[PDB]
PDB file of C-alpha atoms and ligand atoms in Angstrom:
ATOM      1  CA  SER A   1     265.285 -52.357 125.827  1.00 47.78           C
ATOM      2  CA  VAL A   2     267.825 -54.850 127.522  1.00 46.81           C
ATOM      3  CA  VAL A   3     266.445 -53.524 130.951  1.00 45.32           C
ATOM      4  CA  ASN A   4     262.899 -54.642 130.081  1.00 45.72           C
ATOM      5  CA  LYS A   5     263.951 -57.895 128.310  1.00 46.69           C
ATOM      6  CA  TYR A   6     265.631 -59.198 131.494  1.00 48.17           C
ATOM      7  CA  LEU A   7     263.507 -57.347 134.052  1.00 51.62           C
ATOM      8  CA  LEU A   8     263.132 -58.663 137.463  1.00 51.21           C
ATOM      9  CA  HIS A   9     260.244 -56.974 139.360  1.00 49.22           C
ATOM     10  CA  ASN A  10     261.618 -58.179 142.741  1.00 46.94           C
ATOM     11  CA  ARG A  11     264.698 -56.118 142.077  1.00 45.50           C
ATOM     12  CA  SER A  12     263.047 -52.853 141.083  1.00 46.38           C
ATOM     13  CA  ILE A  13     263.522 -49.726 143.308  1.00 41.35           C
ATOM     14  CA  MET A  14     261.244 -47.726 141.239  1.00 41.19           C
ATOM     15  CA  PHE A  15     259.162 -46.984 144.314  1.00 39.40           C
ATOM     16  CA  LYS A  16     256.072 -44.694 143.884  1.00 39.13           C
ATOM     17  CA  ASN A  17     255.775 -43.481 147.566  1.00 38.58           C
ATOM     18  CA  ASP A  18     256.415 -44.360 151.196  1.00 35.18           C
ATOM     19  CA  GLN A  19     254.059 -47.246 151.118  1.00 33.34           C
ATOM     20  CA  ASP A  20     256.034 -48.913 148.315  1.00 28.56           C
ATOM     21  CA  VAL A  21     259.190 -48.221 150.486  1.00 28.33           C
ATOM     22  CA  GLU A  22     257.735 -49.942 153.600  1.00 28.76           C
ATOM     23  CA  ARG A  23     256.460 -53.055 151.628  1.00 27.43           C
ATOM     24  CA  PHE A  24     260.016 -53.410 150.126  1.00 25.54           C
ATOM     25  CA  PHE A  25     261.673 -53.242 153.586  1.00 24.90           C
ATOM     26  CA  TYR A  26     259.166 -55.737 154.956  1.00 25.49           C
ATOM     27  CA  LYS A  27     259.938 -58.089 152.091  1.00 25.95           C
ATOM     28  CA  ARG A  28     263.772 -57.668 152.213  1.00 23.69           C
ATOM     29  CA  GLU A  29     263.906 -58.183 155.908  1.00 24.56           C
ATOM     30  CA  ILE A  30     262.223 -61.614 155.422  1.00 21.10           C
ATOM     31  CA  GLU A  31     264.245 -62.538 152.266  1.00 20.46           C
ATOM     32  CA  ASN A  32     267.486 -61.462 153.455  1.00 22.99           C
ATOM     33  CA  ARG A  33     267.591 -63.828 156.467  1.00 26.89           C
ATOM     34  CA  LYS A  34     267.189 -66.989 154.188  1.00 26.31           C
ATOM     35  CA  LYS A  35     270.300 -68.814 153.018  1.00 22.67           C
ATOM     36  CA  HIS A  36     271.325 -67.520 149.642  1.00 20.38           C
ATOM     37  CA  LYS A  37     271.491 -70.163 147.039  1.00 20.62           C
ATOM     38  CA  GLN A  38     272.848 -70.554 143.493  1.00 23.82           C
ATOM     39  CA  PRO A  39     270.006 -70.252 140.814  1.00 25.41           C
ATOM     40  CA  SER A  40     268.491 -73.560 140.373  1.00 24.52           C
ATOM     41  CA  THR A  41     268.732 -73.480 136.473  1.00 24.27           C
ATOM     42  CA  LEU A  42     272.111 -71.894 136.298  1.00 23.85           C
ATOM     43  CA  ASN A  43     275.008 -74.046 134.841  1.00 20.83           C
ATOM     44  CA  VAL A  44     278.015 -72.537 136.827  1.00 20.86           C
ATOM     45  CA  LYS A  45     281.088 -73.544 134.756  1.00 21.66           C
ATOM     46  CA  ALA A  46     283.655 -72.569 137.360  1.00 25.67           C
ATOM     47  CA  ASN A  47     284.129 -74.861 140.371  1.00 25.54           C
ATOM     48  CA  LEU A  48     282.159 -73.616 143.351  1.00 25.53           C
ATOM     49  CA  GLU A  49     283.095 -73.571 146.924  1.00 28.06           C
ATOM     50  CA  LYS A  50     280.201 -72.941 149.421  1.00 30.41           C
ATOM     51  CA  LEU A  51     282.027 -71.630 152.509  1.00 32.52           C
ATOM     52  CA  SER A  52     281.124 -69.682 155.615  1.00 32.30           C
ATOM     53  CA  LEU A  53     283.177 -66.951 157.704  1.00 29.88           C
ATOM     54  CA  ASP A  54     281.710 -66.379 161.253  1.00 28.08           C
ATOM     55  CA  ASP A  55     278.103 -67.488 159.922  1.00 30.01           C
ATOM     56  CA  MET A  56     278.336 -65.269 156.894  1.00 29.14           C
ATOM     57  CA  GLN A  57     278.005 -67.182 153.593  1.00 28.64           C
ATOM     58  CA  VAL A  58     280.982 -66.886 151.326  1.00 26.01           C
ATOM     59  CA  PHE A  59     280.994 -68.415 147.824  1.00 24.55           C
ATOM     60  CA  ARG A  60     284.193 -68.984 145.969  1.00 23.70           C
ATOM     61  CA  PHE A  61     284.470 -69.493 142.217  1.00 23.28           C
ATOM     62  CA  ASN A  62     287.713 -70.949 140.598  1.00 22.45           C
ATOM     63  CA  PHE A  63     288.484 -72.478 137.229  1.00 18.97           C
ATOM     64  CA  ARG A  64     291.277 -74.862 136.173  1.00 19.60           C
ATOM     65  CA  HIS A  65     292.605 -74.897 139.867  1.00 19.82           C
ATOM     66  CA  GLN A  66     293.676 -71.263 139.589  1.00 19.18           C
ATOM     67  CA  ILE A  67     293.571 -69.755 143.164  1.00 16.85           C
ATOM     68  CA  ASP A  68     296.829 -67.886 143.677  1.00 14.73           C
ATOM     69  CA  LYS A  69     295.172 -64.681 142.924  1.00 12.62           C
ATOM     70  CA  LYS A  70     291.777 -63.512 144.356  1.00 11.77           C
ATOM     71  CA  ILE A  71     288.979 -60.985 143.330  1.00 12.09           C
ATOM     72  CA  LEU A  72     286.913 -59.844 146.380  1.00 10.12           C
ATOM     73  CA  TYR A  73     283.644 -59.261 144.698  1.00 11.56           C
ATOM     74  CA  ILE A  74     281.197 -56.901 146.382  1.00 11.76           C
ATOM     75  CA  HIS A  75     277.768 -57.359 144.643  1.00 15.00           C
ATOM     76  CA  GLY A  76     275.288 -54.501 143.789  1.00 13.29           C
ATOM     77  CA  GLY A  77     271.707 -54.391 145.159  1.00 12.23           C
ATOM     78  CA  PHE A  78     271.575 -51.260 147.246  1.00 14.58           C
ATOM     79  CA  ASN A  79     272.556 -53.076 150.449  1.00 18.27           C
ATOM     80  CA  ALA A  80     269.013 -54.452 150.432  1.00 14.73           C
ATOM     81  CA  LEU A  81     269.050 -57.019 147.634  1.00 14.66           C
ATOM     82  CA  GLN A  82     271.116 -60.262 147.589  1.00 12.99           C
ATOM     83  CA  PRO A  83     272.775 -61.307 144.418  1.00  9.86           C
ATOM     84  CA  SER A  84     270.921 -61.531 141.202  1.00 16.12           C
ATOM     85  CA  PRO A  85     271.142 -64.719 139.254  1.00 12.92           C
ATOM     86  CA  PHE A  86     272.851 -62.526 136.618  1.00 12.14           C
ATOM     87  CA  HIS A  87     275.381 -61.623 139.114  1.00  9.81           C
ATOM     88  CA  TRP A  88     276.107 -65.421 139.488  1.00 10.44           C
ATOM     89  CA  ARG A  89     276.482 -65.607 135.759  1.00  8.97           C
ATOM     90  CA  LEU A  90     278.719 -62.462 135.487  1.00 12.50           C
ATOM     91  CA  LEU A  91     281.131 -63.867 138.319  1.00 10.69           C
ATOM     92  CA  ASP A  92     281.315 -67.253 136.635  1.00 10.49           C
ATOM     93  CA  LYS A  93     282.393 -65.385 133.468  1.00 10.04           C
ATOM     94  CA  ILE A  94     284.883 -63.105 135.157  1.00  8.50           C
ATOM     95  CA  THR A  95     286.490 -66.310 136.868  1.00 11.95           C
ATOM     96  CA  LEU A  96     286.786 -68.092 133.518  1.00 11.65           C
ATOM     97  CA  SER A  97     288.286 -64.956 131.887  1.00 12.22           C
ATOM     98  CA  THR A  98     290.639 -63.692 134.530  1.00 11.66           C
ATOM     99  CA  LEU A  99     291.586 -67.081 136.217  1.00 12.49           C
ATOM    100  CA  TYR A 100     291.480 -65.352 139.504  1.00 14.30           C
ATOM    101  CA  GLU A 101     289.507 -66.937 142.342  1.00 11.84           C
ATOM    102  CA  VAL A 102     286.346 -64.806 142.686  1.00 13.03           C
ATOM    103  CA  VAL A 103     285.122 -64.511 146.218  1.00 11.15           C
ATOM    104  CA  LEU A 104     281.470 -63.538 146.879  1.00 12.99           C
ATOM    105  CA  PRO A 105     280.585 -62.514 150.503  1.00 10.98           C
ATOM    106  CA  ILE A 106     276.784 -62.466 151.186  1.00 10.90           C
ATOM    107  CA  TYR A 107     277.434 -59.339 153.516  1.00 10.07           C
ATOM    108  CA  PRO A 108     274.807 -58.063 156.029  1.00 12.87           C
ATOM    109  CA  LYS A 109     272.022 -56.264 154.354  1.00 14.37           C
ATOM    110  CA  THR A 110     269.435 -53.600 155.273  1.00 12.08           C
ATOM    111  CA  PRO A 111     266.794 -53.079 156.647  1.00 12.38           C
ATOM    112  CA  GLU A 112     267.835 -55.371 159.449  1.00 13.80           C
ATOM    113  CA  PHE A 113     271.597 -54.422 159.331  1.00 17.23           C
ATOM    114  CA  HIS A 114     273.487 -51.220 158.744  1.00 17.82           C
ATOM    115  CA  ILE A 115     276.499 -49.574 157.552  1.00 18.31           C
ATOM    116  CA  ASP A 116     279.055 -50.764 160.205  1.00 24.28           C
ATOM    117  CA  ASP A 117     277.735 -54.351 160.026  1.00 24.34           C
ATOM    118  CA  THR A 118     278.258 -54.388 156.270  1.00 24.37           C
ATOM    119  CA  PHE A 119     281.700 -52.948 156.475  1.00 28.74           C
ATOM    120  CA  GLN A 120     283.038 -54.972 159.310  1.00 29.65           C
ATOM    121  CA  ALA A 121     281.984 -58.158 157.393  1.00 26.84           C
ATOM    122  CA  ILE A 122     283.848 -57.039 154.316  1.00 25.91           C
ATOM    123  CA  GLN A 123     287.039 -56.348 156.405  1.00 25.84           C
ATOM    124  CA  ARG A 124     286.896 -59.952 157.929  1.00 25.73           C
ATOM    125  CA  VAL A 125     286.712 -61.620 154.378  1.00 23.24           C
ATOM    126  CA  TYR A 126     289.361 -59.248 152.947  1.00 23.84           C
ATOM    127  CA  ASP A 127     291.642 -60.068 156.106  1.00 26.92           C
ATOM    128  CA  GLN A 128     290.986 -63.731 155.264  1.00 25.23           C
ATOM    129  CA  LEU A 129     292.046 -63.448 151.762  1.00 25.69           C
ATOM    130  CA  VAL A 130     295.146 -61.332 152.400  1.00 27.71           C
ATOM    131  CA  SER A 131     296.314 -63.945 155.049  1.00 26.80           C
ATOM    132  CA  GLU A 132     296.120 -66.651 152.263  1.00 27.64           C
ATOM    133  CA  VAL A 133     297.932 -65.001 149.321  1.00 27.73           C
ATOM    134  CA  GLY A 134     299.139 -61.614 150.292  1.00 26.80           C
ATOM    135  CA  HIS A 135     297.555 -58.213 149.551  1.00 23.58           C
ATOM    136  CA  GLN A 136     299.420 -57.795 146.287  1.00 22.10           C
ATOM    137  CA  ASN A 137     297.505 -60.844 145.054  1.00 18.38           C
ATOM    138  CA  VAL A 138     293.917 -59.473 146.114  1.00 16.37           C
ATOM    139  CA  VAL A 139     292.002 -57.299 143.772  1.00 12.77           C
ATOM    140  CA  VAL A 140     288.751 -55.661 145.025  1.00  8.87           C
ATOM    141  CA  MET A 141     285.782 -55.332 142.634  1.00  9.52           C
ATOM    142  CA  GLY A 142     282.182 -54.219 142.930  1.00  7.60           C
ATOM    143  CA  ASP A 143     279.135 -53.129 140.960  1.00  7.72           C
ATOM    144  CA  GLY A 144     276.393 -50.546 141.573  1.00  7.30           C
ATOM    145  CA  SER A 145     276.116 -49.834 145.390  1.00  9.99           C
ATOM    146  CA  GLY A 146     278.692 -52.603 145.484  1.00 11.09           C
ATOM    147  CA  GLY A 147     281.221 -50.433 143.525  1.00  7.85           C
ATOM    148  CA  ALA A 148     280.481 -47.608 146.243  1.00  4.89           C
ATOM    149  CA  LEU A 149     281.022 -50.278 149.044  1.00  2.00           C
ATOM    150  CA  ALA A 150     284.281 -51.391 147.226  1.00  2.00           C
ATOM    151  CA  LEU A 151     285.631 -47.945 146.871  1.00  3.68           C
ATOM    152  CA  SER A 152     284.664 -46.948 150.525  1.00  4.49           C
ATOM    153  CA  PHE A 153     286.227 -50.062 151.799  1.00  4.56           C
ATOM    154  CA  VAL A 154     289.547 -49.548 150.181  1.00  6.78           C
ATOM    155  CA  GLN A 155     289.467 -45.922 151.372  1.00  6.41           C
ATOM    156  CA  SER A 156     289.062 -47.449 154.926  1.00  6.96           C
ATOM    157  CA  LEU A 157     292.036 -49.631 154.397  1.00  8.30           C
ATOM    158  CA  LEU A 158     294.026 -46.602 153.121  1.00  8.89           C
ATOM    159  CA  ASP A 159     292.940 -44.356 156.060  1.00  7.03           C
ATOM    160  CA  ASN A 160     293.803 -47.111 158.413  1.00  6.35           C
ATOM    161  CA  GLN A 161     297.214 -47.848 156.958  1.00  2.61           C
ATOM    162  CA  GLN A 162     296.108 -51.489 155.952  1.00  7.03           C
ATOM    163  CA  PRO A 163     297.818 -53.474 153.316  1.00  3.22           C
ATOM    164  CA  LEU A 164     295.941 -52.292 150.095  1.00  2.17           C
ATOM    165  CA  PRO A 165     294.654 -54.520 147.152  1.00  2.00           C
ATOM    166  CA  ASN A 166     296.830 -54.557 143.885  1.00  2.00           C
ATOM    167  CA  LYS A 167     293.876 -53.046 142.079  1.00  2.00           C
ATOM    168  CA  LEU A 168     290.185 -51.744 142.461  1.00  2.00           C
ATOM    169  CA  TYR A 169     287.566 -52.289 139.873  1.00  2.00           C
ATOM    170  CA  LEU A 170     284.383 -50.345 139.912  1.00  2.00           C
ATOM    171  CA  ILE A 171     281.376 -51.174 137.703  1.00  2.00           C
ATOM    172  CA  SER A 172     278.661 -48.517 137.485  1.00  2.00           C
ATOM    173  CA  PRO A 173     279.496 -47.461 141.067  1.00  2.00           C
ATOM    174  CA  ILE A 174     276.953 -45.147 142.853  1.00  2.00           C
ATOM    175  CA  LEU A 175     279.566 -42.771 144.082  1.00  2.00           C
ATOM    176  CA  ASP A 176     277.159 -40.360 145.606  1.00  2.00           C
ATOM    177  CA  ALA A 177     274.257 -41.888 147.402  1.00  2.00           C
ATOM    178  CA  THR A 178     272.186 -38.557 147.249  1.00  2.00           C
ATOM    179  CA  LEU A 179     272.236 -38.603 143.425  1.00  2.00           C
ATOM    180  CA  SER A 180     271.802 -34.752 143.610  1.00  2.00           C
ATOM    181  CA  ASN A 181     274.603 -33.749 141.219  1.00  2.00           C
ATOM    182  CA  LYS A 182     273.203 -30.755 139.285  1.00  2.00           C
ATOM    183  CA  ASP A 183     274.633 -32.016 136.136  1.00  2.00           C
ATOM    184  CA  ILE A 184     272.190 -34.807 136.141  1.00  2.00           C
ATOM    185  CA  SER A 185     269.698 -33.564 133.612  1.00  2.00           C
ATOM    186  CA  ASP A 186     266.093 -34.552 133.027  1.00  2.00           C
ATOM    187  CA  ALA A 187     267.262 -35.997 129.757  1.00  4.23           C
ATOM    188  CA  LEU A 188     269.598 -38.337 131.645  1.00  5.77           C
ATOM    189  CA  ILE A 189     266.825 -39.262 134.177  1.00  2.26           C
ATOM    190  CA  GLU A 190     264.524 -40.229 131.388  1.00  2.95           C
ATOM    191  CA  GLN A 191     267.288 -42.594 129.881  1.00  3.27           C
ATOM    192  CA  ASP A 192     267.756 -44.425 133.220  1.00  4.15           C
ATOM    193  CA  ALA A 193     265.207 -47.292 133.665  1.00  6.81           C
ATOM    194  CA  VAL A 194     266.971 -48.716 136.618  1.00  6.93           C
ATOM    195  CA  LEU A 195     268.012 -46.110 139.121  1.00  8.37           C
ATOM    196  CA  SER A 196     265.554 -43.947 141.161  1.00 10.28           C
ATOM    197  CA  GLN A 197     266.724 -41.031 143.286  1.00 11.87           C
ATOM    198  CA  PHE A 198     263.764 -41.615 145.632  1.00 13.13           C
ATOM    199  CA  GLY A 199     264.578 -45.521 145.839  1.00 15.40           C
ATOM    200  CA  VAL A 200     268.383 -44.995 146.341  1.00 18.68           C
ATOM    201  CA  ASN A 201     267.758 -42.111 148.902  1.00 19.40           C
ATOM    202  CA  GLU A 202     265.256 -44.200 150.972  1.00 18.40           C
ATOM    203  CA  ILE A 203     267.208 -47.438 150.900  1.00 18.54           C
ATOM    204  CA  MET A 204     270.524 -45.855 151.674  1.00 15.77           C
ATOM    205  CA  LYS A 205     268.976 -43.665 154.480  1.00 14.14           C
ATOM    206  CA  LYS A 206     267.799 -47.004 156.220  1.00 13.67           C
ATOM    207  CA  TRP A 207     271.180 -48.488 155.685  1.00 11.36           C
ATOM    208  CA  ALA A 208     273.081 -45.436 157.021  1.00 10.86           C
ATOM    209  CA  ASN A 209     271.099 -45.591 160.303  1.00 10.86           C
ATOM    210  CA  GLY A 210     271.379 -41.843 161.220  1.00 11.89           C
ATOM    211  CA  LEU A 211     274.492 -40.989 159.326  1.00 10.75           C
ATOM    212  CA  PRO A 212     274.028 -38.257 156.530  1.00 11.62           C
ATOM    213  CA  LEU A 213     274.053 -39.660 152.934  1.00 14.62           C
ATOM    214  CA  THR A 214     277.001 -37.240 152.188  1.00 12.40           C
ATOM    215  CA  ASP A 215     279.235 -39.158 154.785  1.00 11.61           C
ATOM    216  CA  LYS A 216     282.284 -40.241 152.775  1.00 12.29           C
ATOM    217  CA  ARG A 217     281.723 -43.840 153.949  1.00 10.30           C
ATOM    218  CA  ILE A 218     278.364 -43.749 152.252  1.00 11.13           C
ATOM    219  CA  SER A 219     279.266 -41.545 149.236  1.00 13.26           C
ATOM    220  CA  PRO A 220     282.910 -42.395 148.625  1.00 11.68           C
ATOM    221  CA  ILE A 221     283.206 -39.547 146.066  1.00 11.33           C
ATOM    222  CA  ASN A 222     283.787 -37.588 149.225  1.00 11.71           C
ATOM    223  CA  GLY A 223     286.491 -40.009 150.598  1.00 14.34           C
ATOM    224  CA  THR A 224     290.206 -40.239 150.409  1.00 16.47           C
ATOM    225  CA  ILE A 225     291.789 -40.219 146.996  1.00 17.69           C
ATOM    226  CA  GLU A 226     295.506 -39.737 147.549  1.00 20.41           C
ATOM    227  CA  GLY A 227     297.247 -43.082 147.936  1.00 17.24           C
ATOM    228  CA  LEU A 228     294.601 -45.388 146.296  1.00 17.11           C
ATOM    229  CA  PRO A 229     295.756 -48.280 144.300  1.00 17.06           C
ATOM    230  CA  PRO A 230     295.066 -48.061 140.524  1.00 16.78           C
ATOM    231  CA  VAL A 231     291.348 -47.921 139.760  1.00 14.83           C
ATOM    232  CA  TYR A 232     289.573 -49.365 136.681  1.00 13.84           C
ATOM    233  CA  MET A 233     285.991 -48.078 136.181  1.00 12.48           C
ATOM    234  CA  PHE A 234     283.241 -49.243 133.860  1.00 13.01           C
ATOM    235  CA  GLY A 235     280.031 -47.417 133.387  1.00 14.20           C
ATOM    236  CA  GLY A 236     277.329 -46.330 130.768  1.00 15.40           C
ATOM    237  CA  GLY A 237     276.160 -42.835 129.426  1.00 10.49           C
ATOM    238  CA  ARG A 238     272.556 -43.926 130.028  1.00 10.42           C
ATOM    239  CA  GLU A 239     272.866 -44.118 133.983  1.00 10.44           C
ATOM    240  CA  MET A 240     272.107 -41.300 136.346  1.00  7.82           C
ATOM    241  CA  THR A 241     275.640 -42.068 138.051  1.00  8.54           C
ATOM    242  CA  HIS A 242     277.401 -40.972 135.006  1.00  9.63           C
ATOM    243  CA  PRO A 243     277.991 -37.258 135.918  1.00 10.46           C
ATOM    244  CA  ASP A 244     279.463 -38.667 139.303  1.00 10.00           C
ATOM    245  CA  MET A 245     281.803 -41.046 137.507  1.00 12.80           C
ATOM    246  CA  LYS A 246     283.131 -38.292 135.402  1.00 12.37           C
ATOM    247  CA  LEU A 247     283.474 -36.060 138.476  1.00 11.06           C
ATOM    248  CA  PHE A 248     285.286 -38.888 140.261  1.00 13.09           C
ATOM    249  CA  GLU A 249     287.536 -39.303 137.250  1.00 13.96           C
ATOM    250  CA  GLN A 250     288.339 -35.706 137.302  1.00 11.24           C
ATOM    251  CA  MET A 251     289.358 -35.826 140.924  1.00 10.34           C
ATOM    252  CA  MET A 252     291.608 -38.888 140.546  1.00 11.86           C
ATOM    253  CA  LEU A 253     293.423 -37.135 137.572  1.00 10.78           C
ATOM    254  CA  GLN A 254     293.839 -33.863 139.560  1.00 10.08           C
ATOM    255  CA  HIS A 255     295.337 -35.906 142.501  1.00  9.02           C
ATOM    256  CA  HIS A 256     297.619 -37.969 140.070  1.00 11.03           C
ATOM    257  CA  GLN A 257     296.028 -41.097 140.911  1.00  9.52           C
ATOM    258  CA  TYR A 258     295.889 -43.813 138.004  1.00  6.17           C
ATOM    259  CA  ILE A 259     292.334 -44.303 136.700  1.00  6.16           C
ATOM    260  CA  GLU A 260     291.023 -46.053 133.584  1.00  9.32           C
ATOM    261  CA  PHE A 261     287.545 -45.103 132.770  1.00  5.79           C
ATOM    262  CA  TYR A 262     285.931 -47.333 130.204  1.00  4.23           C
ATOM    263  CA  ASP A 263     282.732 -45.279 129.351  1.00  2.00           C
ATOM    264  CA  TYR A 264     280.070 -46.927 127.189  1.00  2.88           C
ATOM    265  CA  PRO A 265     277.872 -43.972 125.915  1.00  2.00           C
ATOM    266  CA  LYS A 266     274.681 -46.009 125.095  1.00  2.00           C
ATOM    267  CA  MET A 267     274.894 -48.488 127.980  1.00  2.00           C
ATOM    268  CA  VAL A 268     272.576 -48.749 131.101  1.00  2.00           C
ATOM    269  CA  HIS A 269     273.294 -48.961 134.781  1.00  3.58           C
ATOM    270  CA  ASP A 270     275.169 -52.227 135.654  1.00  2.00           C
ATOM    271  CA  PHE A 271     275.266 -53.212 132.042  1.00  5.18           C
ATOM    272  CA  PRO A 272     277.890 -56.112 132.277  1.00  6.77           C
ATOM    273  CA  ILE A 273     275.193 -58.135 134.047  1.00  5.16           C
ATOM    274  CA  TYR A 274     273.184 -58.449 130.813  1.00  2.96           C
ATOM    275  CA  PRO A 275     273.946 -61.107 128.229  1.00  4.04           C
ATOM    276  CA  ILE A 276     275.080 -58.624 125.506  1.00  2.45           C
ATOM    277  CA  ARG A 277     278.093 -58.147 123.361  1.00  2.00           C
ATOM    278  CA  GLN A 278     279.231 -54.917 125.331  1.00  2.00           C
ATOM    279  CA  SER A 279     279.357 -56.990 128.550  1.00  2.00           C
ATOM    280  CA  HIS A 280     281.584 -59.503 126.978  1.00  2.00           C
ATOM    281  CA  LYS A 281     283.831 -56.605 125.770  1.00  2.00           C
ATOM    282  CA  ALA A 282     283.869 -55.138 129.374  1.00  4.87           C
ATOM    283  CA  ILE A 283     284.845 -58.543 130.662  1.00  3.51           C
ATOM    284  CA  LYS A 284     287.635 -58.869 128.161  1.00  2.00           C
ATOM    285  CA  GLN A 285     288.875 -55.453 129.230  1.00  2.00           C
ATOM    286  CA  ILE A 286     288.815 -56.523 133.001  1.00  2.00           C
ATOM    287  CA  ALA A 287     290.833 -59.629 131.919  1.00  2.32           C
ATOM    288  CA  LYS A 288     293.419 -57.556 129.809  1.00  4.45           C
ATOM    289  CA  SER A 289     293.954 -54.876 132.434  1.00  2.00           C
ATOM    290  CA  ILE A 290     293.768 -57.010 135.656  1.00  2.00           C
ATOM    291  CA  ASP A 291     297.446 -58.340 135.111  1.00  2.00           C
ATOM    292  CA  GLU A 292     299.047 -55.044 134.249  1.00  2.00           C
ATOM    293  CA  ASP A 293     302.208 -54.239 136.393  1.00  2.00           C
ATOM    294  CA  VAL A 294     301.287 -51.807 139.139  1.00  2.00           C
ATOM    295  CA  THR A 295     304.145 -49.324 139.056  1.00  2.00           C
ATOM    296  CA  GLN A 296     302.327 -46.356 140.761  1.00  2.00           C
TER     297      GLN A 296
HETATM  298 BR1  LIG B   1     278.083 -48.221 124.023  1.00  3.45          BR
HETATM  299 CL1  LIG B   2     264.852 -40.179 139.715  1.00  2.83          CL
HETATM  300 NA1  LIG B   3     286.015 -67.429 152.898  1.00  2.37          NA
END
């Protein structure tokens, strides 16, 4: 399996019990305070800018001096993990394929920080980028829990009458943090070697800081749909989020909101982070679609 071939134990949320959860939070509190660094062995092909915004680390990737257009990238990791070395590699590839400048904020993480900290930080970097190139030249993208953050954040902009990004990209978004969709079968659960209902529940409960997991800011499947910019979603049939992605697609369609869903039946959660041909195909689909004229 691709999951096992590239496994990082320090990113696993397959917790057995409360004791594993506590140990994870203990570890993440300590690790999250450290300055995040590019992987020591990774050749990043794009040019890299190591910036900060109000003491938050922000990395920017650009290629061939192409910076007139931005992707605000919200990385996965359940709001507890920092970017994977495979996230570094994915972002590099997207930069080189799209020729947008990819912006990677290291936003506040749980267990020390909580939902409002996370969202206020994303707002600040979004505002920064809009001031640089205009909202029409900014695309928002995220994977996993980062896809949830990305959708929830654009929904916040929409609810608050803020200028919206030209497009919104969701990669294996965790649209409902409860993962209680009754269409999630045992067969589907047995195919998913990455997600854990227990792990996602427990981590998200910590981050939510007293808010119910069903709150639309946490589970954006429950958030504003009408008025969204065009949405482009990527996911696999072997991830427990798949019923939620299909449900979200149905809701977008019903509300006459533009959605492209690229659904890969045999792919795993967050598949584009893996060095496999399907990832390269997904990246090419991002590149081909990202410059489509927005006429909605
Ligand atoms: Br596939
Ligand atoms: Cl599970
Ligand atoms: Na910045």
